[PDB]
Ligand binder design. Structure first.
Ligand SMILES: CC[C@H]1OC(=O)[C@H](C)[C@@H](OC(=O)N2C=CC[C@@H]2c2ccc(NC(C)=O)cc2)[C@H](C)[C@@H](O[C@@H]2O[C@H](C)C[C@H](N(C)C)[C@H]2O)[C@](C)(OC)C[C@@H](C)C(=O)[C@H](C)[C@H]2NC(=O)O[C@@]21C
Ligand SMILES: [Mg+2]
Ligand SMILES: [Mg+2]
Ligand SMILES: [Mg+2]
Ligand SMILES: [Mg+2]
Ligand SMILES: [Mg+2]
Ligand SMILES: [Mg+2]
Ligand SMILES: [Mg+2]
Ligand SMILES: [Mg+2]
Ligand SMILES: [Mg+2]
Ligand SMILES: [Mg+2]
Ligand SMILES: [Mg+2]
Ligand SMILES: [Mg+2]
Lengths: 108, 205, 113, 134, 58
RNA sequence: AAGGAACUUUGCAAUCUCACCCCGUAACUUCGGAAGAAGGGGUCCCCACGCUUCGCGUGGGGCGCAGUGAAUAGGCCCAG
RNA sequence: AUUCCUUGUCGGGUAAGUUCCGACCUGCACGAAAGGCGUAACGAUCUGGGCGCUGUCUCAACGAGGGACUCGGUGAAAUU
RNA sequence: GAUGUCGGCUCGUCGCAUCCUGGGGCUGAAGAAGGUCCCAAGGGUUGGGCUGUUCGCCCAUUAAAGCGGCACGCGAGCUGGGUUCAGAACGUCGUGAGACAGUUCGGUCUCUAUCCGCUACGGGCGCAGGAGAAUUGAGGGGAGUUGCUCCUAGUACGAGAGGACCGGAGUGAACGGACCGCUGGUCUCCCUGCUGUCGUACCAACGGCACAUGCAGGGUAGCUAUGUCCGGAACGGAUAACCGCUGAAAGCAUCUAAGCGGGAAGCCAGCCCCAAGAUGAGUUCUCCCACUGUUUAUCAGGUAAGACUCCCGGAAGACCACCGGGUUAAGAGGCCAGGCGUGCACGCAUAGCAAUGUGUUCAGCGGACUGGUGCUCAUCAGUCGAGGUCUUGACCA
């Protein structure tokens, strides 16, 4: 509609960079994702979500990864923004051999 | 009152404290002041601002004169902002401030002809218990012999979208002047690379 | 709305056959007269085949062989045409509009390499 | 997203094994016990929401028996729950914990992990017996 | 029978009135630069077969 | 997605089931039946050995989300 | 498939059951080859329930194809 | 010489004799909870089980789960469960053929809208020259709901139990608009895997067919809700019931007969959207400038400013319209780089008898995404478009 000579790509890339975090290599196979539970009152707690990486999705600010784990007999899937402040550090626990990019079949 | 013209750039994810904020990146570029409208000359108080630069060749003589009378250098868009004065040539610096609630207005992405279901919400009909009128089709357009008419204003299928929409009390999250950028919490109407009009909150809460 | 991008006046199977058929014809003949639209649609697909062939290795041939089922045409594109377009920064294929036909009143056009 | 007719797992040893949603309420919890509804509509129950339910199957021997009309708070959902930082949680099966008109559990134990949202929704006792709070 | 049907014959006036928009638009024919026999804008000249140089046969 | 008959006159419609082999199988009965009851498992590729062949059986190994890998292809039960 | 009063009354099932099953008897107006009562099996019969599954539904979305829309060619109709 | 009939659904709108919210008066009104009457139609008025049901009873909620009109609103909008055709059975009646106050199972609901009306979209001419833009708002429409919690304050009130008005914070539910960043859905050939068979001579590697994707796994842009963001307001002006001020008639008294103030979710304005065909056709800025044509051609013809036609496209769109580009060019395509999707290519080498595995290889492929770049086509042109009526008045040399 307004025909301004603009590279929206870079304008966006510009904003997103001060909100983008690089994490260890990780493609599937196990990860201890140590997250911080600030909300437990005014007190800041520490929890650790460890399980298989089922998906990796997005780029820049929007980049995320999905971790699946069986905890107390019931299945749990958690999705994390790489650049989330409540995420402290992700750590590769054991590298996995996989033939695809999504792993959703592991849900059965 | 206060106002600016810009181009919707896009939507991204940002964090302020620990909370993730959906932001709409807007280029509220420099807006030259092209005409001042006074009660003495125009009968009302307002300002004509301009937005995207136009190649001199592409501009016609009538627009050349109008731009020359203010020594501006052709824009492409020209909008008026009522009860707004501040001297010089309008930029977001001190016009807007982080935290300010604003009223961003654009032109909704137009969706051509749309049925009463998509356009008015409707309900359509049964998918199975014997139809002909399966999903979209409105019901009864009226009554019987009394108003031999169908009510004026009746909700019916038509051209949906490509309309003026003002979204109220949007929060100002970040401002990068010189980069001529302004981040707004939430979604502004219209498509990327479209004209937006950022004004001071119409009636702030 | 409908802000997608490509054409299809037939069904999946056919839309492919047509593109591959007109791609084989232009490369066989060098110039073909067809409906303006069918010509507009053909342009990117054949231009893409020239770039694949510009590789000049087995893999590049076999990739052409996937859309060019005529053995002689694949050799022509591989060893004759792609080489000629070495320094052409992929552009060549041009469209010329001829004019309206009798039976359907359709504006015909030319597509030459 | 739980609506009437939705059958769900019981995350307690109250006696019930499966409850079937009868009604989704506006999940009160203020001083006097559970607060009166925040409307008569309200489509879906999420985690931290209070539902009225019919007990479709119970274990032999235990406080809650089959056919009884009970109140339960949703503790797990297959429908994803979003958080303030932008993270998401989702559980393989949806589950609830039977409560009294005070909002306190009817069983002595909570089974499986529970949504942190129950804590924000002021369900201390439930959170208290929960083996994990994700 | 044939469900909605017209209630009255439409007058000679009425019928012709809807015809106000049927009038064809004559082509914008241009003189050809190198055989002069008229051509359509952006099309190859039918007579000489030129489009700067001669593109088509005859 | 989540939910699963809340649809409705009525699960109308559409899913689910779906072949062959092994295991297994209720009330009731006119002793034939009910029965494909119900329910479970197998199914591809290679190699070795055994055998009645197109083959099949044991054993070890391989690959994919998935092996009647596409097509043909029972949903079942209780009571009147 | 017979009951007017009638959604009879108690029980079952359901969160909730004008239907359905079971008793009861007050059979408007059952009843013994215009056969009475029962019966395994059979049924594109009719009725009520359950499991399974599902866009029937909350609540609809996206996608495809053929029409509808546009141009060239041919060009009807009931009605008035 | 035909005005289709119960119930459902769909879609609405209206009355108020108001179900909820809003304002009041009386109370056998301490407070909290109420009863009753007055004003009040702005919005709102839930999901199920039973029955063809309207109704009604029940479950579970709610601020409330209002009553009625619109051919018992609505079948050229849908259903077809009820009822009223032909079949068949039961109970009853008739000697019978048959019948019903009944009951029961079954049973063809007709592709094309002419006018008016309604939603959307253009073409024409007008608006005293011809043009390109920016507008004022006469008028019109949209919207209008409400809970819970806290604070005030455990205060007023009450012996206690209990427990406020008024004012002030939050936070939801339903509904609406927008939007696609997120979570997801889809994404008919963008990537992979799989079967049978046929073909590219064979092997290897591919292609068709198995759907109008053969099947499976995943999936960008786009579109999307079940996902986000915002919204209903505040202030005001005039009022309703009602509460008062000054106050006679009627030396007193009285809100009323003169005059005055207050006072509702209602009215008018404010918010969002349309709007000068507002023939009462408005305002402002800028441009072009006062051509030429025989008493044969009576006003046509070259033209200006400007636009149209045509081409290439588009988060615009049925068509038309709208926006951009059209070589003085980055408009689209290609091509290059990048993103992203798929997930390790062919070919070779090695290991194994082999099926396969490993390396080369974060590989190969490639729709729609973000830039760059003159390789392709936007070539060449044609059509149209002012020279400004008269009257009166003020200023002018
Ligand atoms: C399919 C096309 C054919 O039309 C037809 O069959 C349709 C279905 C019939 O519709 C109907 O019966 N209904 C339509 C509305 C109600 C009724 C109806 C009523 C009860 C039920 N019950 C259930 C539960 O199902 C079903 C339908 C038509 C329209 C009949 O007309 C209706 O007659 C009623 C007596 C009086 C109605 N009005 C006046 C009130 C009038 O509308 C009729 C008799 O034709 C049968 C006309 C003559 C002209 C013809 O014979 C033409 C030539 C047909 N012949 C041919 O082949 O074409 C046709 C047009
Ligand atoms: Mg995803
Ligand atoms: Mg629907
Ligand atoms: Mg019996
Ligand atoms: Mg038979
Ligand atoms: Mg035609
Ligand atoms: Mg009738
Ligand atoms: Mg009608
Ligand atoms: Mg997505
Ligand atoms: Mg797929
Ligand atoms: Mg007042
Ligand atoms: Mg142009
Ligand atoms: Mg590009």
């Amino acid at each position: 509609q307004t025909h301004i000579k603009i590279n929206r790509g870079e304008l966006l890339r510009g904003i997103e960079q001060d909100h983008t975090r690089q994490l260890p290599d990780f493609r599937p196979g196990d990860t201890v994702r140590v997250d911080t539970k600030v909300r437990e009152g005014n007190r800041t707690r520490s929890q650790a979500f460890e399980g298989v990486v089922i998906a990796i999705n997005g780029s820049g600010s929007r980049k995320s990864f999905t971790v699946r784990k069986i905890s107390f007999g019931e299945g749990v899937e958690r999705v994390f923004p790489f650049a989330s402040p409540l995420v402290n550090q992700v750590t590769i626990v054991e590298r996995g051999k996989v033939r695809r990019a999504k792993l959703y079949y592991l849900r059965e | 009152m206060k106002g600016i013209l810009g181009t919707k750039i896009g939507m991204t994810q940002i964090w302020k404290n620990d909370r993730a904020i959906p932001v709409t990146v807007v280029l509220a570029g420099p807006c030259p002041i092209v005409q001042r409208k006074t009660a003495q000359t125009d009968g009302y108080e307002a300002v004509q601002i301009g937005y995207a630069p136009k190649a001199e060749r592409k501009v016609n003589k009538p627009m050349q004169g109008h731009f020359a009378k203010a020594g501006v250098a052709p824009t492409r868009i020209l909008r008026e902002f009522r009860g707004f004065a501040p001297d010089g040539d309008s930029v977001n610096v001190d016009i807007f401030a982080e935290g300010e609630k604003i009223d961003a207005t654009g032109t909704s992405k137009g969706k051509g002809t749309q049925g009463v279901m998509k356009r008015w919400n409707f309900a359509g009909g049964p998918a199975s218990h014997g139809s002909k009128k399966w999903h979209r089709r409105p019901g009864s357009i009226g009554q019987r012999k009394t108003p031999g008419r169908v009510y004026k204003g009746k909700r019916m299928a038509g051209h949906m979208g490509m309309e003026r929409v003002t979204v109220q009390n949007l929060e100002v999250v970040e401002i990068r002047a010189g980069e001529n950028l302004i981040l707004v919490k939430g979604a502004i109407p219209g498509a990327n690379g479209g004209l937006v009009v950022l004004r001071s909150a119409a009636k702030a809460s | 709305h409908g802000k997608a991008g490509r054409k299809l006046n037939r069904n999946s199977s056919a839309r492919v056959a047509l593109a591959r058929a007109q791609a084989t014809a232009l490369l066989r003949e060098g110039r073909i007269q067809t409906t303006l639209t069918k010509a507009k649609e053909l342009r990117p697909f054949v231009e893409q085949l020239i770039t694949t062939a510009k590789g000049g290795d087995l893999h590049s041939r076999r990739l052409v062989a996937q859309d060019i089922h005529d053995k002689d045409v694949v050799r022509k594109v591989m060893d004759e045409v792609a080489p000629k377009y070495a320094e052409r920064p992929g552009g060549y294929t041009r469209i010329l509009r001829v004019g309206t036909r009798r039976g359907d009143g359709v504006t015909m056009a030319l597509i030459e390499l | 997203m739980i609506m009437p007719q939705s059958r769900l797992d019981v995350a307690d040893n109250s006696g019930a094994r499966e409850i079937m949603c009868i009604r989704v309420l506006n999940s009160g919890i203020g001083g006097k016990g559970l607060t009166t509804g925040g409307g008569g509509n309200k489509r879906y129950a999420h985690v931290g929401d209070i539902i009225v339910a019919s007990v479709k199957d119970a274990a032999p021997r235990g406080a809650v028996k089959a056919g009884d009309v009970v109140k339960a708070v949703v503790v797990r959902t297959s429908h994803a729950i979003k958080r303030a930082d932008g993270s998401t949680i989702r559980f393989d099966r949806n589950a609830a914990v039977i409560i009294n008109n005070q909002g306190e559990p009817r069983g002595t134990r909570v089974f499986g992990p529970v949504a942190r949202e129950l804590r924000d929704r002021r369900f201390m006792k439930i959170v208290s017996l929960a083996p994990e709070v994700l | 029978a044939k469900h909605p049907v017209p209630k009255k014959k439409t007058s000679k006036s009425k019928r012709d009135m809807r015809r106000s928009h049927h009038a064809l638009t004559a082509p914008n024919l241009t003189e050809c630069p190198q055989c002069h026999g008229k051509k359509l804008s952006h099309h190859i000249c039918p007579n000489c077969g030129y489009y700067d140089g001669r593109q088509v046969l005859a």
